[PDB]
Design a protein around this ligand. Sequence first.
Ligand SMILES: Nc1ncnc2c1ncn2[C@@H]1O[C@H](CSSCc2ccccc2)[C@@H](O)[C@H]1O
Ligand SMILES: Nc1ncnc2c1ncn2[C@@H]1O[C@H](CSSCc2ccccc2)[C@@H](O)[C@H]1O
Lengths: 273, 274
Amino acid sequence: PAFHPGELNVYSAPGDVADVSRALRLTGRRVMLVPTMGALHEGHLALVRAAKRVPGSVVVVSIFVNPMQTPDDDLAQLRAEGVEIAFTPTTAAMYPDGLRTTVQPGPLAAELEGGPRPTHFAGVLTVVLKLLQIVRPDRVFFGEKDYQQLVLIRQLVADFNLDVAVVGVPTVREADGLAMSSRNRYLDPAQRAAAVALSAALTAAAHAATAGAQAALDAARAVLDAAPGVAVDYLELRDIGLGPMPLNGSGRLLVAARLGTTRLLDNIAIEIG
Amino acid sequence: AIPAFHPGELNVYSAPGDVADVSRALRLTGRRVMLVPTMGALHEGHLALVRAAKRVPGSVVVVSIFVNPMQPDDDLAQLRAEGVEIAFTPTTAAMYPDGLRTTVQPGPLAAELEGGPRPTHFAGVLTVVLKLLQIVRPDRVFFGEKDYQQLVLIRQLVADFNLDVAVVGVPTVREADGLAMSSRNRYLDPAQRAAAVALSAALTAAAHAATAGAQAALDAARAVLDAAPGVAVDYLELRDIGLGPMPLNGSGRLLVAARLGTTRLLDNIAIEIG
Ligand SMILES: Nc1ncnc2c1ncn2[C@@H]1O[C@H](CSSCc2ccccc2)[C@@H](O)[C@H]1O
Ligand SMILES: Nc1ncnc2c1ncn2[C@@H]1O[C@H](CSSCc2ccccc2)[C@@H](O)[C@H]1O
C-alpha cells in the first residue's frame, strides 16, 4: 500500500487507507478527515483548508455516496488544494453485510430534517462511525451549513467516547449571502434570485434579536413571506445544542424551504437581548 | 502529564480519560494492550480470560469492571494475584454523562435466542463494548464462549464498524461434572445442582452423537434433557458457527437454555456434523 507525499494518493480499499493513515500517524503527521459525498464546491474547500492549516496535517478527503439514508473533477480540485489522500470506497466494501449493526441516534434525529425522513440520521452517523474507524483521524471536519448533522455528530463522538476532535466550519456564502450548495445549481434566475430570502431573513432576525426572540422570528418570518415562491418547511429557534428555546441568552436559528422541488437549508448564530 | 502508572502492580482508574491516556502511552512503548470486559464478582471463568490475555508476548492486561444498566477489593485482589496491571472501574455517571443517547442497534441476531426474553439486552451490551473499545483501544479484546451469542454479535460490531481489534473467544471453564461456571450456580439447591449437570451432559452427548448427523445430535441432547427433573428448556438449537440456519455438514454450534427453579442456565458447544 503506497503513499507518494506532496501528491494526491487515491485509495479504494478500507484496508489501504487504514494502513497508510496509521503509518502516517506514526511519522508525527496529524491526520485530518473531511468526509464528503462528492460534488465539491467552494463550500467543501473551506473544510479542506481549515484542515490544511493544521500544523503537521495530512488531509484525507472521503468521497462516498451512501445508498441508505463527478469523481474526476472532485479529484482535480483536490490535487489542486494540495490534498494528499482521497478515500473512495465501493458500496460493497462499505456494506459487505448490508445493514446489520447500525447506529441509532438520539431523539434529536427525529426532529427538523429527521421529521419527514426518520432514518436519515441513522444512515449518516453509521457511515461517519465507519469512516472514523477506518481512518482514525485526529480531527474531523464538518460545515455549519448542515448544523443539525453537526450537532448529531458531536453526540456521536461524545456518547461513544471517540477519540477525535469535531471541528465545525462556518458556512460559505455567495456574494449576496446565499449558502453555497450543490442544490443551487438547480434554480431558474427566477427561483435563484428569490433564494436570497433565506439568508436575508436569518441575518435580519439576528439583528432584530436585541428586541428579543419574538421580534427575531417575526423579522425572519416577514422576510420569507415577502419572497415569491419560497415555501417554508420550518423556521425554528433553538439553543446551540438544539434543545428548547435558548432561555433568552444565545442560540441557533434554522431554516428549511422549497423553491420548486429544490429544498434549501440555512442557519445562523443568534443572541437574544 | 499521563496519569500515574506503576509497572508490575494493580493500577486502578475510574476516569475514562486516565485509562485512555495510559493505554495510549504504554502502546507507544511497545506493550500490546489486551482488554477483559467484566461485570465484577469474578471467578475461574473470568480468570481464564485474564490468563489468555497475559499469555501474549508483551501484553499489558486491562480488566474493566462496570455494571451495564440497559442489559469489590475481593475482585481486585483476584486481579493482583493474577498479575494484571490495569483495572478500570468507572461510575455509571462517568460512562453515561448524558444518559442513554446515541446507541448501537444490532443486526436481527439480537432478536433471537437470548434476545427472545430480553429484546433490548444486546443493544445495551454492544453499546458499552463499543465504549470500552474506544476508551482503552486494545489490540485484542476477550470474551468467554460461555455467552456465545454475545460473542458472535461483538464480532459483528467489529466487522460492521470497522473496529481495529481482534476479538478472542475464550473456552468455557467448567466444574468437575462439566457444569459451566457462572455466578448463578451458587443459587441452585442440591437437587437442582444435581439436575443442572444435564445441560453439559446433553451438549457433549450431542457432540459425539453428531458423526451420525444433525437429527442424531439433537435427539441425543433432547434425551439427556428429558431424563432430568425440574429442568424447563427455553430452547435447544443447532446453528452454523456464526449463528445462521442449522447447517447440513461440517462445523456448527449447539446452544441450550433452561430454568431450574428461578435460575436460568445457558451453555453451548462446538459441533462437527457427520
Ligand atoms: N456552503 C457550505 N459551507 C460550509 N460547509 C458546507 C457547505 N456545503 C456543504 N458543506 C459541508 O459539506 C460536508 C460533506 S457532505 S455530508 C457530510 C457527510 C459525508 C459523508 C458521510 C456522512 C456525512 C458537510 O459537512 C456539509 O456541511
Ligand atoms: N464459566 C465461564 N467460562 C468462561 N467465561 C466465562 C464464564 N462465565 C463468564 N464468563 C465470561 O466472563 C466474561 C465476563 S462476563 S461480562 C460480559 C460483558 C462485559 C462488559 C460489557 C458487556 C458484556 C464474559 O466474557 C463471559 O462470557
